[PDB]
Design a protein around this ligand. Sequence first.
Ligand SMILES: OC[C@H]1O[C@@H](O[C@H]2[C@H](O)[C@H](O)[C@H](O)O[C@@H]2CO)[C@@H](O)[C@@H](O)[C@@H]1O
Lengths: 335, 335, 335, 335, 335, 335
Amino acid sequence: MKTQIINGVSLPNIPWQDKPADCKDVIWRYDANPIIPRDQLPTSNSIFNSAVVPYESEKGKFAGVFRVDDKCRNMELHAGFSKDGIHWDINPDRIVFEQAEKSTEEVNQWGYGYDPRVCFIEDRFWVTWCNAYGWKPTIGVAYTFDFKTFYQCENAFLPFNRNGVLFPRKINGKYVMFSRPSDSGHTPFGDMFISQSPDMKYWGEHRHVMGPLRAWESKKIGAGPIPIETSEGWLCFYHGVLESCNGFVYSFSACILDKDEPWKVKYRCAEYLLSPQKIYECVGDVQNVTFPCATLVDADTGRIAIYYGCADTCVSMAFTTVDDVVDYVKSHSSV
Amino acid sequence: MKTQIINGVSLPNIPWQDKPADCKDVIWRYDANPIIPRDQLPTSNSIFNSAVVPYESEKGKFAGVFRVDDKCRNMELHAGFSKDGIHWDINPDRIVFEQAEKSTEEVNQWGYGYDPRVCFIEDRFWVTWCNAYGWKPTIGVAYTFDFKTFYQCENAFLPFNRNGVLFPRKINGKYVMFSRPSDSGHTPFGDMFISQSPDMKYWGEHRHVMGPLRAWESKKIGAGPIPIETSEGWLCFYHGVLESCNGFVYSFSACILDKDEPWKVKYRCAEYLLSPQKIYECVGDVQNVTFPCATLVDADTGRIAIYYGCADTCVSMAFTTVDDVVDYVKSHSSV
Amino acid sequence: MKTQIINGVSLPNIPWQDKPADCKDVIWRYDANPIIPRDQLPTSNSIFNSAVVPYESEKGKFAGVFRVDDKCRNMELHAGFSKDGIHWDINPDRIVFEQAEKSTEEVNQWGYGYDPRVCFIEDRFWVTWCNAYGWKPTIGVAYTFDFKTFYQCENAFLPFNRNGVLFPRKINGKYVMFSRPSDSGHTPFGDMFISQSPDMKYWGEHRHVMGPLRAWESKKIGAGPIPIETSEGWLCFYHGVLESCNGFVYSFSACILDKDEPWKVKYRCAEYLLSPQKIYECVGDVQNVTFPCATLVDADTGRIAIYYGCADTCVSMAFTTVDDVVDYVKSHSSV
Amino acid sequence: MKTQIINGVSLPNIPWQDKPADCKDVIWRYDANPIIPRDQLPTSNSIFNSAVVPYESEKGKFAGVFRVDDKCRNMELHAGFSKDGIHWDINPDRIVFEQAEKSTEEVNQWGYGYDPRVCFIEDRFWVTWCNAYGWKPTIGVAYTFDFKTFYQCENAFLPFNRNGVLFPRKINGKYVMFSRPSDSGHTPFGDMFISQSPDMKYWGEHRHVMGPLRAWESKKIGAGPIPIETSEGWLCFYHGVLESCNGFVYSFSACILDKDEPWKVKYRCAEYLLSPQKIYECVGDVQNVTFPCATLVDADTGRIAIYYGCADTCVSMAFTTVDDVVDYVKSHSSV
Amino acid sequence: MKTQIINGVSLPNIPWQDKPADCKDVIWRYDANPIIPRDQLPTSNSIFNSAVVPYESEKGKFAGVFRVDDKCRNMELHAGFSKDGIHWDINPDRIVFEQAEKSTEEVNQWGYGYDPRVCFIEDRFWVTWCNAYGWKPTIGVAYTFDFKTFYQCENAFLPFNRNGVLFPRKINGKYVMFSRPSDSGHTPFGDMFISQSPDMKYWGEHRHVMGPLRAWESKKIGAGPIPIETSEGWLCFYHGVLESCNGFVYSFSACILDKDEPWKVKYRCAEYLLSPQKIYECVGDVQNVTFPCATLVDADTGRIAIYYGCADTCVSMAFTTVDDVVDYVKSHSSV
Amino acid sequence: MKTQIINGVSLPNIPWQDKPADCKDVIWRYDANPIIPRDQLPTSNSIFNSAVVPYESEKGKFAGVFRVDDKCRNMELHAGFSKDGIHWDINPDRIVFEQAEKSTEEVNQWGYGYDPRVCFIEDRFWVTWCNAYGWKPTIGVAYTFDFKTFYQCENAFLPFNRNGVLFPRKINGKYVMFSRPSDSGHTPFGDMFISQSPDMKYWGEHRHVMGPLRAWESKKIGAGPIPIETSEGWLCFYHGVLESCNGFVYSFSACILDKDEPWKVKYRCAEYLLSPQKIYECVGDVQNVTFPCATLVDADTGRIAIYYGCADTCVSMAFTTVDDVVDYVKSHSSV
Ligand SMILES: OC[C@H]1O[C@@H](O[C@H]2[C@H](O)[C@H](O)[C@H](O)O[C@@H]2CO)[C@@H](O)[C@@H](O)[C@@H]1O
């Protein structure tokens, strides 16, 4: 493989299907989508925009935190487990958080939570999500060792903010997190930023990554799954929004960020790599949405399995390789 | 049966299908929806949000008033009949109202009409609908003995108003009507109210029923079909709207209102009972709409046949029981 | 006088100032405006848009109900008294209503109230105002014999409604009230309607009077002071709004409506008769507002003294005559 | 045939399917829609709203200019060719214009272009489209002799403008073009106008054709394909928009305009003739869109083949006849 | 003088006041503003944004076209005359246009007209203004020899357009006009364009001049008075808009444009040269407006007398020199 | 005095005027307002919302940081000095920041800055203001020893944020700062928050203080001047906004916050203490604004001098005492 995967994991059991010969795209879709239907739970209205990592437990080889919207249309997080990454056993009830320190007992009352991102850092799995603080969106922060008990920390930022995503290691001695300053509704703007922290409590040294650019991402953008570390830099899949007369179209693509100053863009794919086109992507609670919150990467082979929300209704899977993505991103770069 | 139907009728021939073994919901859909397609009439663009009652005539055992939008997209009402309550003979031409009294000849010039509700009271059938007065929406009123000739009365209210639904009898010697103060557009608010009238012409004693509460009903709510009198109070199905970045999503559920002062809420289901999920509910003239304007109730058995509009395009049917709905409403009550 | 005053009152002591010789307008302003400053009460932020009638008491020859906004910006009504109609003794505290019947003790909790209109009808003074029902604007109704105790009745209409103004007698055996369907905000539309009532409780036979027409009144209109009965019909001063790039401009003019069917417009002045031009009219809490809620009329001379709110800040006075206004209205009529 | 085709062409080889016997519409769809799928080009996100004419080349009997949006969602024009007018060979790369005159070399830099209309006039083919002048929409103008090389002329108008459509010959010695004054976004309005030019460069004598009228066309309208000269006058299909709570619905119909002064409406169909009802019309990048930019007409038989964008995603075809459309328009005429 | 005036006139009688000693601005106000108050005519609500040129008549040495809004708030044009350029005799009644050619007899129905600009070209005075065509704003065109009879020509453009201003001679054989593409309301955008015409009827070769830039002009810009020819090129005062939370703030400044291609900016002043600061500029019908539609220039000395609308209420005057404006524009230039 | 000032300073020379006998308000205005006119600098368009502290230098006994908007309407910070705190010597040119550490040389390029707040903490003066990061509003931080050289630090937060105000000492060993999450425009919402930092670089432990509550403050609130430490807790003046049909009205009041956890409100005045009422508060660049950013407090007497911006045009002064404000806050407390 041309590009190397750095600080990765060997994943011979990664969910995978080979690219079809007729496929002329960088990314191809699993052929039995969705992998998680809207009604997998007795209480679920929809299940989408969800987080997935390798994890060995008694219930399989992968664990996750899943956004579940229930039949009240409350937004919640559920832990799940899978043997193959495709058929998922999702907890019937929501994650109920324990506070990590007593100092957040008063502040961190549960209201809602959605679009989780999860990555392993040094000794535990960190979770970020869009968390309500006084019914305002901000980035909630927690950790888990086992995906059974979850320990909530301080919200990283003031409202209004969404799409908080952690880099999977420290950079120049600090935790680094993507976020995306928003407003109190269906935000008509959005640039990606990073913020930095020595301790995962206090945040600062905020840095602008990039804003809307090409037509398919003209309205707003945000981070998607965990950044993937490569010899080229951080490979970061992100969503971008086009506004039609009838609303938003959510597609996603990738960029490559500088390894040590990840707010500096090296490459940025001018085209989307996947866009809402299939019936489960176009029809549903929110039409025309393909929204990636996790990927698995087999460092041995460069194989990527992408988890993405479809029409805010279900979870689907798509496939590609690091080499394919990096080559396309570099040869089809914006600015 | 646990909950008793009051002032009901015996409907052994109620359209009905049993609840599928796999169905884990309170309400289940007819397995051959829609029962009335957008194009059933030579002139119709769409047929939805419609009123049905038991009524014996030369053309069947049920009758109704149907919302038919033509190929000008004008909004009209057509009378209709059916032997089984599923396969419908809808008049090709619109209802042309006669004035009940000569003193409304000037005022009640036809503009448009939609979303009728119909119920028998003491000696005739009363029809309410969203009626244009000077091209502004208010609640039209009419009566019929035979669903052949319709006699229009005074509009009950000033604009702007919609979702006017009559209680099926007098309460404390007064006619009682659900309505829903609106605006001149696609109203971004909506609470349910009742108004009262001794003579069906002059209205007063307005009482606030309830407003938007849970997420699925957070933007606006409105009355649906005719209230059902039970031993628990008035069982009222109603619609509720959630607003996404792309538009409105219309679901429905139910509440129980006090017998004597129906504006007082006893129970209110925190969850929707049916939401737009099938292709014919999510795809059409207006995406993601499931909008109930009528139910048939078999007082003997407690079986319910619900008629609801789908995507503002067609009419579908769904089934449940009084006991099942009452149980769920009470066990999952809001406030 | 060419036009007669019908069912009027002899008012030789009417506040009055002769037309300045340089004045070329139909209506002319009192030369010492405002007659009531924003800070006349210790608690008042502003006092405007208020109702005034003749009334013999211990504190004068005139009484009224005054909109007073306090230093919380709460909207309230205060009774007031005056010897001359110009210098007012306004109660420091709000009217706290008694319910006329116990059946409204639950429903009529006090939220806010503003823009009162008052007229004598047969045996008492009736008051209408924009009354909050569940924090939504509608028309409150009350009566008083002495401006010391006020007895509140049922809100006449559902929300959202404002500018409810009573005709000062029954017409065709019914009470008749101007109102003006609105929305939940700074309403960007508005037509005048009337509704009718046998008993001041239940309302119906809603009739459209007129909507926005000339430029100065292009955005919305509404009833101003009590209708004045005249041998030409009902002389009705009303307000009209023009919308600039910077907000609203409130002017007022007059129309003449049919004596027997008051929703039928006979004449309607194409020009405004007064608009925001003085510093106390253009500067204050709400710029560019001249808003009439009361006139005094001397039936003997046809002299009219007009009370109007200025910039939602103070109350001012203007003068004109029935003959002057009627002639100008007739010679400069729209449709 | 009852209505004669004037200055038309003989097209025995026009794409054609007969009207099915069950069919109760003026216009029936091709039974294997869409005829050009979204993914026919390796780089295409969507292909829709396209222009087509008879033209004999080495690659077929028809040629065209196609709107292609790429995987950047850039909006572009591609030349295309076809033997049967149904299966299309579309150039993989965009048209790169050459300037007709040196004087536009600085001015006409390529930004974007979409929704072309093309007709032969006198000695060449004229192309109009919505062209970006400094990223503002106006009407681009070009000609071609061979659909290989395209020569760009002056933008006909100032922004903001769209739906520029040439009449297929001079009228009273002047070129005449439909356009449609717009704004900088998803325009919430739109009336049809014509403009006139002695020389295809300077434009004037602007005349208002018509504006929004019936419910299906109540938000805005705009020209569709090239006007068809007939014995009744100019037969012009146009699109009309209805606004629902979730967005826009594009349908199309026809009007007949005066032969000598085409801004004068002679007949205008009150109903649409085709609206979004099929899955490929209702689901796609922009839901609920049927948008015509081209028709073929066989003057020998009166047969019409219509090309129309579906859901801004694909190109579809429909059929009708001149006599059928004309007859329906006349018998169902607006004003 | 340092900058020469080209093709100017000798105006020793130009209205004038020397710059006060304490003044630190490039432009200083006349010390008895306004020169035309809102009520100068018996029917006027306001008089502002008006056009002025040298012209010898029986009524003085200056003539003008004045925007007069009446007490209907109709927008009109009145011709006027002055001996000194400061005190004005304005016609009581509106200009009633005569059609230059029979061909515009049907098109040009009077609706409204505002903000005229006027200049002499070769043999007559040309008048442009914002003219209603079917109640939509575009640029009206007329000429006059004596300011008594006014001959209307074709509207130069389609709606929606405003701020049409002619250059006072042909450039490269063509008439050249500023305009400013707008929308159907209080336009939240605006770039200056020019358009060119061989004959004052057909327009083409549209070029972008410039758009909003600095903070004071960040919302929108538009041409002001007639361009002034200098040895530096075309000296052009334009207005610019800042949007606060309460509305728009209209100031004006100046740019210098290329003599041969006036759409090319040579210099543009980063600061405004005048903004709303006096009581008569900040208070009135539209707050915070200083809007220039005319200047007089004495070519012999470089003195400029600026006429400008204040608060859309009255007409004021300000003074400056060509050398001062030029020096300041060049030394404080944007881009 | 009844309420003790804690950690205050002796300030015998505080600017002061006694309360007029006729004054019935808690706060009275300086009798020669404004103390700083809009045109005090040769380049200033307006000077308002400004910061002031006791500081002995060669130019006086008080120093400050002033918001100056220039004739470009750029927003800037200028240093200034006063002998008496009323008459000010304001530096003609903006503050050009030096970076505290080299590591912000790249990020902290100057865009704009406004509404500074300044307080002395342990050994230096700290300055917060609304600072542009990539032309988006956030909170800038800097410090100074002499008000001659200013050292910029890291922006405390991500956009979008405004009204950053430091508490004047550490609390539980952490810096505490008010802020107010905003959006990209004229924010139509706003709650007060605090954030905490061990080092003035990294921020976290965000706590919600309070949101809009009373009518005068119904649209949004934000912190005003530096908190004052008293025996009741933290006396904090703050601004709140009412939205009328013509825009915003900015008033201010005071609340009392818990000593140890200042996000917990102890008292909150229901009324405003000062609102726009004078000509210089109601007329100017932004009508109806009274906006406090600094107070001087004489601990020996409890006299308070308040600096506040008027109509975003000038700086004014007002007077009150700690005892007067605290007593009124407690006895007129909200929740
Ligand atoms: O907004 C005042 C300035 O704007 C422009 O025109 C107005 C016009 O007076 C009228 O209000 C119309 O309805 O709307 C326009 C505002 O959009 C300017 O060209 C000028 O007239 C005004 O100073």
